[PDB]
Amino acid sequence: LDKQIQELVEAIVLPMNQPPKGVLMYGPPGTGKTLLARACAAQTKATFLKLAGPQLVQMFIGDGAKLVRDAFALAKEKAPSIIFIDELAGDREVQRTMLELLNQLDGFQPNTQVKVIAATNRVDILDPALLRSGRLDRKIEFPMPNEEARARIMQIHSRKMNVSPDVNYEELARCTDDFNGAQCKAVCVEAGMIALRRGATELTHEDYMEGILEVQ
Amino acid sequence: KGCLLYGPPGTGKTLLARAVASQLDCNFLKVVSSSIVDKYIGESARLIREMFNYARDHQPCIIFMDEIDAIGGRTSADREIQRTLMELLNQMDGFDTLHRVKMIMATNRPDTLDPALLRPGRLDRKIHIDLPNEQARLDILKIHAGPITKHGEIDYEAIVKLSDGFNGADLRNVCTEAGMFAIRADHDFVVQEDFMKAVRKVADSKKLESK
Amino acid sequence: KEQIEKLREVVETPLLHPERFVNLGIEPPKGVLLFGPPGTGKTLCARAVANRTDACFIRVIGSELVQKYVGEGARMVRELFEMARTKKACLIFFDEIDAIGGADNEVQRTMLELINQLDGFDPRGNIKVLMATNRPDTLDPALMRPGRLDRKIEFSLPDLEGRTHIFKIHARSMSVERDIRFELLARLCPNSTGAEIRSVCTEAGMFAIRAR
Numbered sequence: 001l002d003k004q005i006q007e008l009v010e011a012i013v014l015p016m017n018q019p020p021k022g023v024l025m026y027g028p029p030g031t032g033k034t035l036l037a038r039a040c041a042a043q044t045k046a047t048f049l050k051l052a053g054p055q056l057v058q059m060f061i062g063d064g065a066k067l068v069r070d071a072f073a074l075a076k077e078k079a080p081s082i083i084f085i086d087e088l089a090g091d092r093e094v095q096r097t098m099l100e101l102l103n104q105l106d107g108f109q110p111n112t113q114v115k116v117i118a119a120t121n122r123v124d125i126l127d128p129a130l131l132r133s134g135r136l137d138r139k140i141e142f143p144m145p146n147e148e149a150r151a152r153i154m155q156i157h158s159r160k161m162n163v164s165p166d167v168n169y170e171e172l173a174r175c176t177d178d179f180n181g182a183q184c185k186a187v188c189v190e191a192g193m194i195a196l197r198r199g200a201t202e203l204t205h206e207d208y209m210e211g212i213l214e215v216q
Numbered sequence: 217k218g219c220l221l222y223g224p225p226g227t228g229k230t231l232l233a234r235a236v237a238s239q240l241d242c243n244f245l246k247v248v249s250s251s252i253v254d255k256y257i258g259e260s261a262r263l264i265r266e267m268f269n270y271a272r273d274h275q276p277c278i279i280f281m282d283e284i285d286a287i288g289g290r291t292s293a294d295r296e297i298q299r300t301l302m303e304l305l306n307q308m309d310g311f312d313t314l315h316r317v318k319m320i321m322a323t324n325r326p327d328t329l330d331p332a333l334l335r336p337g338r339l340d341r342k343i344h345i346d347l348p349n350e351q352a353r354l355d356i357l358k359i360h361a362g363p364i365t366k367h368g369e370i371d372y373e374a375i376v377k378l379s380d381g382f383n384g385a386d387l388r389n390v391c392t393e394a395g396m397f398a399i400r401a402d403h404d405f406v407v408q409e410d411f412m413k414a415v416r417k418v419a420d421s422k423k424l425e426s427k
Numbered sequence: 428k429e430q431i432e433k434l435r436e437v438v439e440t441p442l443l444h445p446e447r448f449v450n451l452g453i454e455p456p457k458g459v460l461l462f463g464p465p466g467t468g469k470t471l472c473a474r475a476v477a478n479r480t481d482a483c484f485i486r487v488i489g490s491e492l493v494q495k496y497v498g499e500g501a502r503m504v505r506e507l508f509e510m511a512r513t514k515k516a517c518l519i520f521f522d523e524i525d526a527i528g529g530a531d532n533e534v535q536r537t538m539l540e541l542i543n544q545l546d547g548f549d550p551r552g553n554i555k556v557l558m559a560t561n562r563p564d565t566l567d568p569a570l571m572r573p574g575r576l577d578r579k580i581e582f583s584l585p586d587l588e589g590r591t592h593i594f595k596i597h598a599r600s601m602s603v604e605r606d607i608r609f610e611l612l613a614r615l616c617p618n619s620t621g622a623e624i625r626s627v628c629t630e631a632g633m634f635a636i637r638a639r
Contacts, residue, residue, distance in 0.1 A: 014400040018393055029573065059532045096248050103246055106385070107238050109392075131425050133389075133418070161453050192453025193578060196436060201451050 001036060001153055004140040008117065009040055016046065016080045019115060021105065024136040026120045028182035030189070032157045033119055034086060041082040049074075053087035056094070064090070065097045075114040088118045095129070105134050142180040147173035150181040154188070161188060166205050175212060187211035217308070217315065220329075220342035221322045227426070228383050229345050230282060233322050235384035242278040242318065245271060249283050258296050264303045271317055279319040288323065288330050301333070348383055350376060356384045357391070364395045367407045374412055379419055386422060393418050428589040431471075433580060434459045438475050438555070456578065458556035462563045463582030466622030470596065472520065472559065484518035485510065489526035492541070497533035501540055508550050516554045524558050528565035538567075546574050583621020593621055600628055601635075 004025055011019045025033055041048050051071060056064035075081060105111050118136065130136045143149055147169040155163075176184065188203075191211035195203055223229025245267070254260045271277050287297045308314055321339065323329060333339070354376050361372075379387055394414035398406040437456050441448060448455035461468070476483060487507060492500050511517045527538045544550065556576050558568070572579075585593060594613040603612045619627055 010400070014396070017400065017402045018389065018396050059535065092250050095250060099248055100246055104244075107234055107241065109238070109389070112396075128427075131427055133421060133425065135425075137421060137425055189453065189577070193456060195452055196440075196448075196456065197433070203452055 001033075001143065001149070003143060004138075005033075005036060005040060007138060008037070009044060012046070012080070012082060012115065012117070013044055015112060015114075018109075018112065020137065021111070021115045021134040022118060022130075022132075022136040023138040024118065024120065024123075025140065026123050027142060028180050028186075029121045030185050031121075031180075031182040032153065032185075034084065035157070036153075037084050037117070037119075041084065044082055047079065047081035049081050049083050051083050051085045053085055057090055062093070064094060068097055068101070080114050082117075083114060084117045084119070086119050086121070088120050098129075102132070102134050150184065154181055154185055157185065158188060161192060162202055164202055164204050167208075172208050172212070175209065179216065183216060184208075184212070187215060190215050217318055218337075218339045219320050220339045221320065221345060222324065222326050222329075222342070223345040224325060225345070225347045227381065228348060229322060229324070231383040231385050232345050232348075233320070235386075235388070237280070237320065238385050238388075242276050243274055245277050245279050247279060247281055249286070252287060252297070252300060254296055258299070260296060260300060261303055264300060264307065268307055272312070272314070275316050277317060279317070281319060281321045283323070284321055285324045285328065288328055288333075290328055290330060301330070348381065353379065353382070353387065357387060360384065360388045360391060364392060365404065365406050367405050369408060371408060374408075375415055378412070378416055381423070381426075382419070390415050390418050390422065428592055429586050430580060430583070430589065431585075431592055433578070434461075434471075437578070438557075439478065441555070442480065455553060457553065457576055458558075458578065460572075460576065460579045461557070461559045461582050463561070464620075464622035465561055466583055466620070466625040467593065467597065468559060468561075468582075469522065472522075474596070482514070482517075484514075484520065486520045486522065489521065489523035492527045492537050493534065497536070500537040504537065504541055504544065508544060511554070512550055516551055518555050520557060520559075522559050523561065524568065525560045525562050525565060528560070528568050530567050542567075542571055545576075546571070585621070587617065590617060590619070590624075593624065597624060597628065600632060 007020070008023055008025065011023065025037075027033065038048065049071075051067075056067050058064075071083065075083065150173075151169060172184070187208060188211065191207040191214075192203060194211075194214075195201070195207065198204075198207065221229060221233040223232070251263075252260060271279065287300075289297060308317070354372060357372055357375055375387075375391070379390065382390070391411070394411045395406060397414040398410035437458050441455050445455070485507065491503060494500060507519065511519055527534060527541075530538065545552075545556070552575060558576075563569075583593065591613055594616075595609070598609055598612065600612075616624070616627055616631075
């Protein structure tokens with residue numbers, strides 16, 4: 001997953017020493033982009049300030065622009081920090097604050113500072129007005145290379161989850177059609193959930209395909 | 217107190233209009249094209265008197281009006297638009313000394329531009345945005361490349377030739393894009409290698425995502 | 428027999444053998460989900476209270492979340508979660524979540540703060556989750572559920588050989604005809620959901636009442 005996070009880390013380290021504003025690092029739920037963007041955000045040495053998606057929409061109205069202009073006030077006044085948001089009428093006001101944001105980033109050029117690192121857990125719905133260099137431009141899907149990378153990030157993300165030493169990775173790597181490694185991680189979650197009633201304390205090989213055919 | 221910026225020859229009307237606008241502007245008051253549909257009761261009149269009343273409280277201001285062709289009809293969809301046009305007539309042609317106020321109007325084609333609104337006074341000076349000339353691209357490159365640091369070797373023909381269909385704001389953000397790309401390695405000087413690489417790659421990203 | 432183990436292995440086992448789940452692999456399980464017709468609802472939870480090992484826990488119903496003079500429900504869920512903090516990860520039971528689920532901003536404070544406390548790992552996120560409701564039309568828990576909760580199953584419907592347990596807990600009716608046989612009531616009515624058997628006691632029991 002270095003081919004998609006390398007551009008992010010470089011893009012957020014270069015202003016401290018224009019950087020891309022919107023990078024879409026997406027994938028199925030349970031991918032681990034928060035623990036890898038935090039495992040690398042700790043290596044960026046900057047201030048790790050957390051922010052979520054539904055935090056903009058609140059009980060009162062007009063709070064989205066309050067948290068956007070407030071996060072851009074603490075970020076505009078403070079040093080270059082790390083803000084990672086996830087799970088990106090009210091939407092008309094979000095488009096007013098968005099077109100105003102890119103009107104201050106396209107009509108003006110003061111944003112030599114922190115950016116908006118956005119990440120979505122599903123790309124079934126995509127606004128056609130999100131296509132620009134300042135908008136979500138780098139849309140990198142799951143890595144096309146072989147299973148090895150999936151076993152590496154899945155093993156690092158699953159260090160506490162043992163594996164029976166009879167696995168070729170070719171059957172599970174081949175059966176997954178139009179699938180990603182996060183869905184296989186959920187397959188490992190369900191397989192480990194039924195591993196209690198299976199009676200075997202060690203996750204077997206057939207439980208992987210049993211989970212694939214179970215949840216997907 | 218008005219200006220018209222149309223781009224019939226093709227794309228670049230908002231890029232060059234927002235390039236000169238990006239060069240000089242005033243207090244920020246944007247009119248989004250989604251705040252006039254008014255799906256509920258058509259009470260947009262008090263919203264126009266309210267926003268422009270704030271434009272009366274603040275003496276200096278520039279009001280951007282982009283993509284006016286959809287609200288430039290010469291059903292009930294156009295009746296509220298013409299109502300906002302009557303509020304504009306009674307708003308700037310009313311009994312008020314609104315001389316310091318300024319506005320900018322942009323469109324796509326000079327054929328359905330409300331020839332009643334095309335009367336002098338309503339839009340004093342209009343600039344016909346044509347296709348980007350190579351001499352205005354070399355000039356805009358020589359005036360947008362001044363304050364940015366560069367190396368002793370200068371070759372502008374690669375930046376003029378490798379950039380097509382761009383305006384002052386595009387070539388501005390792409391040349392400064394290459395300046396930041398070359399300052400990533402915190403070097404005081406900027407060799408034109410990063411100019412060619414970042415202008416080529418980012419220029420291709422703008423040609424692909426130029427919608 | 429199957430479902431009672433699928434819900435018993437998460438209410439009894441996680442407290443009796445904590446090391447078996449830490450060394451068992453993925454993690455100790457979270458809980459189950461009981462949704463559907465009421466039938467014999469809240470009876471198996473009272474059985475789980477009767478099967479308590481050391482200290483009985485405190486129950487929480489869905490009606491307490493909605494009250495007059497809004498603002499007390501947040502301090503109520505935070506004070507019972509604080510009691511869970513003081514009672515070394517005490518058991519928290521939620522009954523009739525449909526009274527607040529399925530999204531009234533004054534209720535959005537209590538239910539969105541409730542989600543912010545369940546999905547939030549501040550007090551604790553792994554003790555015991557369990558929801559007993561009536562209608563599955565709760566959209567918000569259905570979309571925010573896979574975040575932390577899991578193991579969705581039926582309410583009571585057992586397999587063909589599993590009904591005899593819920594009939595051994597439904598043996599507490601008036602009488603069939605005499606004290607000769609329990610199995611005469613327990614095995615002479617198969618293929619009946621855990622609420623359809625409540626329709627067999629209500630309607631077949633009403634037929635035993637209306638039989639002069």
